[PDB]
């Protein structure tokens, strides 16, 4: 079965006996759910995202059912804006990225060509938009705010920017600002024909 990326890849999961909606997120190493009660011992941890770091409760070896597939692994609970299923559980359910096939054991990092430079970027199904580390691109831009796990960052929005990803041509909006990682979001993933599959 094959999930396209024109919309957010939201799915129903079952966890601690309850149903929830969560985002299938190739850009997350770990699974992070909104504040909730889970049984058992937990340890405090910190994780980072596009807007900085947050404190979470780490629960180990928690059963989670996703698209009718059973995973058992680490679930973090804290002030995430969206429930996200990260690579720790996506691998357990046999999910891959396809366009060639890309497995999710490690961060799905690939080379992109943009504005005459070659960069390494993260194929991120949990990003609406593409966000590149600071660079002085020519052209008209407008300011924008974009959010994620620890809050918001200010970025520059450039439109109709030609990109090439894994030999595939795309052209779209690129946001530029102080992101810790270059991110390829769904706006461009849909253009190069990328899907999630399991």
């Amino acid at each position: 079965p094959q999930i396209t990326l024109w919309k957010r890849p939201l799915v129903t999961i079952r966890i601690g006996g309850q149903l929830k909606e969560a985002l299938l997120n190739t850009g997350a190493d770990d699974t992070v759910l909104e504040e909730m009660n889970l049984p058992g011992k937990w340890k405090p941890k910190m994780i980072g995202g596009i807007g900085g770091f947050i404190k979470v409760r780490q629960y180990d070896q928690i059963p989670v059912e996703i698209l009718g597939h059973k995973a058992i692994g680490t679930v973090l609970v804290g002030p995430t804006p969206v429930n996200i299923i990260g690579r720790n559980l996506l691998t357990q359910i046999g999910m891959t990225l396809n366009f060639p096939q890309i497995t999710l054991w490690k961060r799905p990092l690939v080379t992109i060509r943009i504005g005459g430079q070659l960069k390494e970027a993260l194929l991120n199904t949990g990003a609406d938009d593409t966000v590149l580390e600071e660079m002085n691109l020519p052209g008209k831009w407008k300011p924008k705010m974009i959010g994620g796990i620890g809050g918001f960052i200010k970025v520059r929005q450039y439109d109709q920017i030609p990109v090439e990803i894994l030999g595939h041509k795309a052209i779209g909006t690129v946001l530029v600002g102080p992101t810790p990682v270059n991110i390829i979001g769904r706006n461009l993933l849909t253009q190069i024909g990328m899907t999630l599959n399991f």
Binding site: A28, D30, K45, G49, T80, P81, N124, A127, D129, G147
Partner: peptide, 8 residues
């Protein structure tokens, strides 16, 4: 405008 990158 939601960018859910997460690193552990």
């Amino acid at each position: 405008a939601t960018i859910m990158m997460q690193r552990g």
